[PDB]
Amino acid sequence: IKPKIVKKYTGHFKRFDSNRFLRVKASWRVPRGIDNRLRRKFKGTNLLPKIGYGSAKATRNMLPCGLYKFPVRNTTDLEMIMMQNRKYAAEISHAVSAKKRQEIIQRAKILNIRVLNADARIKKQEVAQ
Amino acid sequence: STNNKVTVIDCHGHVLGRVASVVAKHLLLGQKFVLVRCEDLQVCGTLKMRLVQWELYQRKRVNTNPTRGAFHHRSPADMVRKAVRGMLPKNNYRGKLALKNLKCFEGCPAPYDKMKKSSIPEAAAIYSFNPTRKRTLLGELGTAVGWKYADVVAKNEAERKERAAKWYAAKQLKQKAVAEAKEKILADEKYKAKVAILKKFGYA
Amino acid sequence: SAPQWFVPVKAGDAKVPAYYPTDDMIQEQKKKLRTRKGAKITALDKPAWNLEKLRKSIVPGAILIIVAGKYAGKKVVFLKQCIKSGALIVTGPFKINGVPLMRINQRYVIATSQKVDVSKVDTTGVDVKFFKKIAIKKAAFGKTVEEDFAKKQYEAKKALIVEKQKQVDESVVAEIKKVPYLKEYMASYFTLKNGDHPHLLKF
Amino acid sequence: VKYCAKPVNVAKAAQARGDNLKVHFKNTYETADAIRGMKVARAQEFLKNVIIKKEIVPFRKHNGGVGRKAQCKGLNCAFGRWPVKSAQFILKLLKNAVDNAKAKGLNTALLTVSHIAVQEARSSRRRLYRAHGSINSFSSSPCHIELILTEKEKKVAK
Amino acid sequence: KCRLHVNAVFMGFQRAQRNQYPNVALLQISGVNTKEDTPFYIGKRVAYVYKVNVKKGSNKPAIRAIFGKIVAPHGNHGVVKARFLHNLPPKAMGQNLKVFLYPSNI
RNA sequence: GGAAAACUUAAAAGAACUUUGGAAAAAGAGUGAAAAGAGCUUGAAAGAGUAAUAUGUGAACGGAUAAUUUAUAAGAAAAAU
RNA sequence: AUAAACAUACUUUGAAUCGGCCAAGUCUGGUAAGCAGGACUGGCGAUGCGGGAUGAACCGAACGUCGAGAUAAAGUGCCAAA
RNA sequence: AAAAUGAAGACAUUUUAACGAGUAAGGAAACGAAAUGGCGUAAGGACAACAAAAGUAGUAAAGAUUUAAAGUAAUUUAGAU
């Protein structure tokens, strides 16, 4: 069973004038200018982040697979979610070595925990190996 | 499907602006239009009134460079194209593609003189005009403002009428003989079974 | 006892915790996906609860016009309704139309005013058992690969029974030829000529 | 300084390079665009004709104030010049890349100028004395030039 | 083989002077000149069938269609409103659409 | 009155012989775990060069909606009695 | 009579502001002004949206993200939905 | 806002109803039914594999460039180089 996840807006709320100037990044900032075209919500430029875009509470922070992300660092952190394998998916942290990644991936199979980084830091065994 | 055929409008006995409004709407509906005899269209007002209107139009000209300015075409086919273009969207691909499907010619050229002609009842002068309201043909106004090919169209039209006068005379003779031969078949004794169906549904 | 959230799986010489059971006492359980129930099979003559109500114009023996699907524009003769599916059982007599016995939903047909006078039609078969028998099914999932020829083969075996059941057509074919011009009407495709507007058409 | 691209087959390619060459970048950038893709023998002949002003180098991007010439017809560029110094600098690189190919053992007649790239280099500054006690800059515009010569063969993939 | 459809012209989207709503498309069916002849076509199937020149190495179909239904009339001149699975592309304005005879009610 | 300027590597092992060139250098070769090659840890942005892709009538960029192309991406169970 | 318990009464502490401008079935000085100054109210400032082609103030109506419908001002030859 | 439930579930509980424009300006932290809710930078004190080797790391840190995912957003997460 997996509920239908509804995203009210899949675009990005890019900062005003970020498309014209390289010094202005794309991370959102509220236009506070007295004469600003966007904060006055003129026609055409009337797109600001509001709480009305908030996604449903039931499916908020839900991965496309229907589970939730649980960052793990070693084999013991898998035991924290072994009782909720239908709710949480493992996610090995970016700094975990390739050797420890094998133990986390191997143990998660035993405890039936889905891992979303199951193909990360694989050894040279792709071509002719 | 696809509309590969051309709608040929005989602009004789029609009003310039009412023809343009209907065509400009259908050009946006994907139809292909040819308006033959775009010089026989009628406009309201006497020649003196129309010439004054032309003079006002001729005044609009870029002061610093007349070659950039408005171009005032005198050919009646270009008079209609100006009218139709004003009723189509401006400066977008939709309005350029619509205008690519329209043509007037001052007469009936070689392919369009043997095509089926259509009429716009909304644009007919006999419907939208008081009979005593004086009108002007686009050709007569065109000559008064400098259209040099008025008598070329008259010569070409005179030949076209005399060629169609004998084509219609010859075709009438064939149709009269065919209609008689159809009457002998309908009244024939052996065709009773087929004719009975025709009469029962009002086709005979 | 095993907690309801615990389903142990065999470890292939991997390192396991102290609490996890060993492989010598772990039995693999098949993954279970299907949890609903298939539709129950009832008596052949009883109608399904999901029986579509037919239009008043569609009566046995009426000549229909198929306006959608593979045989669009063809004309068929309506026999009866498939009480197990709600679809119409129509024979566009194969000697005339080339349309065999089939099932078509009533929303893809137009009922005409013509009639064929279905009688002694011998409909002993022609039910849900017959249409399921002649259905060309797919090649399953694990049953080898059986490429190319598999679809061709079924048509060969199903042909001898499909042809046989056309004994239904023997009555309707004879009755079609009785009415003049009806035979030509049935074979030809139905078309909208110039000037026929569907909102003004009475069939 | 590294190369912009590596040859597909190092066994059938030759390389030459110059760094901080004392020649104008804008002139050499147009000369390299003219000889890119032609055979090594033709590229050596074209650069020799530029020297004596018999074939033109079309200044396609840097054409501000450049005059029109009669040899700029058919190139989709109304402007061109005959940069002698950049032609001579490329000629010395084209030669060096051929004895590198000869040492490897490649047929010189089958080589082509597959990849040639010009890059900017650090400028050297000088003094220009202006009116009212000002001093401005008199900066050189050197460049790096890379060159890869690869053999040519027909390509087919069924 | 036969004609079982009526050409309807994609007039445009349901719009105002300066806004436009691509959820509803306005079609002009051939032969329907008044809103009183519209009730027949309410609920019928409509397909925008278009041709795409695919490559030989591609398995995409050469002929694609977008299906929809006629839902309501639009004005007193036989123009109808249609809703499609995916909104029609505004590059298809003035193109012809197929109005079928199903879901049949005859 | 009054600045700017830190970093190769564990170790100089700082290329060393040949061909081209007037030379500077380049190409091979070689040292090194790795060119990290002395303008030497990483190497951003502005600015350029190359390669691949795409578009084009007096600005350019942005947004909503579709279409085309590309990419990502959803499965091994299983019917009635 | 009607309405009013997320009613009513407040207490303390504190911000910003006191250049304003517009409309009119209003007034004064002026020949008059897109002039100067006022009485009452609604606005703009601080405000986007639909309409008046364009417009700070006019008309309709005030705004979380959306779907379907009936509408307001105002419109229904084409541009432009009717 | 009002009812209901309430030692820990969890998504800052459950239900019902009303409401949501905004310059200047205000709403510090803590307060189980929370007297607004949060993101980011750096440093300090703790905590971080509970059975005596207890967060990650030469089986590749920080940083850089892009690709995807989560979040209304501030931003975060992961892959590849």
UniProtKB/TrEMBL annotation, chain A:
GO terms for biological process: translation. Pfam families: Ribosomal_L32e. It comes from the Eukaryota. Transmembrane segments: none annotated. The keyword Glycoprotein does not apply. Belongs to the eukaryotic ribosomal protein eL32 family. This is 60S ribosomal protein L32, putative. It comes from Entamoeba histolytica (strain ATCC 30459 / HM-1:IMSS / ABRM).
UniProtKB/TrEMBL annotation, chain B:
Signal peptide: none annotated. GO terms for biological process: negative regulation of translation; translation. One of its GO terms (molecular function) is mRNA binding. The keyword Ribonucleoprotein applies. Keywords: Ribonucleoprotein, Ribosomal protein. It holds the Pfam family Ribosomal_L13. SUPFAM superfamilies: Ribosomal protein L13. It comes from the Eukaryota. GO terms for cellular component: cytosolic large ribosomal subunit; ribosome. NCBIfam families: L13_A_E. Belongs to the universal ribosomal protein uL13 family. This is 60S ribosomal protein L13, putative. It comes from Entamoeba histolytica (strain ATCC 30459 / HM-1:IMSS / ABRM).
TrEMBL record, chain C:
It comes from the Eukaryota. GO terms for cellular component: cytosolic large ribosomal subunit. The keyword rRNA-binding does not apply. Keywords: Ribonucleoprotein, Ribosomal protein. GO terms for biological process: cytoplasmic translation. One of its GO terms (molecular function) is structural constituent of ribosome. Pfam families: Ribosomal_L6e (PF01159). Belongs to the eukaryotic ribosomal protein eL6 family. PANTHER family: 60S RIBOSOMAL PROTEIN L6, LARGE RIBOSOMAL SUBUNIT PROTEIN EL6. This is Large ribosomal subunit protein eL6.
From TrEMBL, chain D:
One of its GO terms (molecular function) is structural constituent of ribosome. The keyword Phosphoprotein does not apply. Keywords: Ribonucleoprotein, Ribosomal protein. Pfam families: Ribosomal_L22. GO terms for biological process: cytoplasmic translation. One of its GO terms (cellular component) is cytosolic large ribosomal subunit. Belongs to the universal ribosomal protein uL22 family. This is 60S ribosomal protein L17, putative.
